[PDB]
């Protein structure tokens, strides 16, 4: 499904992303926007045999298993298909584990490029959270 900006913000808040490890809700809303336009079914093939899945485009080479990616480590110990669900539960759990690594949200290039250091709070402003 394709979430509405505010709808996703509320959902992310419900899923505990606001201030998770020091990252305000805006960061996640902005990251989701640039990575997939709030689309849970978004996918992307990479030069290697890996694919990015979901609203936060998580990679199958390191974070999830799709049963057809060379060098899969499945850090999130989850089927990549779970990251394409209309229910964001799995994508959030994995995002939290990813951000729990030393490089925080820097794991998402789009976030660094389009959100890092910006007034991310603007992404949830106007919403009724």
């Amino acid at each position, epitope marked *: 499904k394709v979430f509405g900006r505010c709808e996703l913000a509320a959902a992310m*808040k*419900r*899923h*505990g*992303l*606001d*201030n*998770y*490890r*020091g990252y305000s809700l805006g960061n996640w809303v902005c990251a989701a926007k640039f990575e997939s336009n709030f689309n849970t079914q978004a996918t992307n093939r990479n030069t290697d045999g890996s694919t990015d899945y979901g609203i936060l485009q998580i990679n199958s080479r*390191w974070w999830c298993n799709d049963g057809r990616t060379p060098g899969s*480590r*499945n*850090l999130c*110990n989850i089927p990549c298909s779970a990251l394409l669900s209309s229910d964001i*539960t799995a994508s959030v*759990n994995c995002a*939290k*584990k990813i951000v*729990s*690594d*030393g*490089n925080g949200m820097n794991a998402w290039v789009a976030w660094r490029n389009r959100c890092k250091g910006t007034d991310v709070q603007a992404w949830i402003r106007g919403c009724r959270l």
Partner: antibody
Amino acid sequence: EVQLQESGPSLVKPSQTLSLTCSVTGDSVTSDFWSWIRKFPGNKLEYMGYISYSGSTYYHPSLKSRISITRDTSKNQYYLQLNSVTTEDTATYYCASWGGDVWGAGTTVTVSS
Amino acid sequence: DIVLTQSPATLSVTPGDSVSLSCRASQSISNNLHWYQQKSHESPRLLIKYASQSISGIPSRFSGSGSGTDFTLSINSVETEDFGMYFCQQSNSWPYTFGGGTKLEIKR
């Protein structure tokens, strides 16, 4: 399935270093984040710290300076080092996955002279 | 550091009765609260993650609810093998911290 096992000296003298090994079986040590948790005498649990895939580590500030967590990819094990211990470091030490789905049986380490 | 306060310190029940355990956070932690069970001579076992998410392989009588600073672990009809310690743990901020635990004991 993945299983963890702690091992190491069960007795450490005050001021010396405590060392523990966690052997990972069933999966690679580089395919998950790993941590150390200790349980003091009165059901007091302390999350000592963890090591993530990038090698980055997070240590409990109470411990900060004394603790070090490392891993060995060829042996598929990760370790805990805690310097200058005192009797207050006597506890049951556990290694576990960051997710908390897998835990070792735990091993007691006593600090005494 | 975030402080987690669990109450009551101890709870005595008869197998078959249902119970509710409380865990309060000194700061809001959204849904980043986890529940662990630890029996005597055994290591901790994860029962509920992120406040209310069920763990495949964990008995259905265990469920969790709450958000922010108020959480609850519920056990519908406590079974004989369910007695022991129960701890909550937050992963919202480093360092991760544990509650003091609640001891579930047998009533007689």
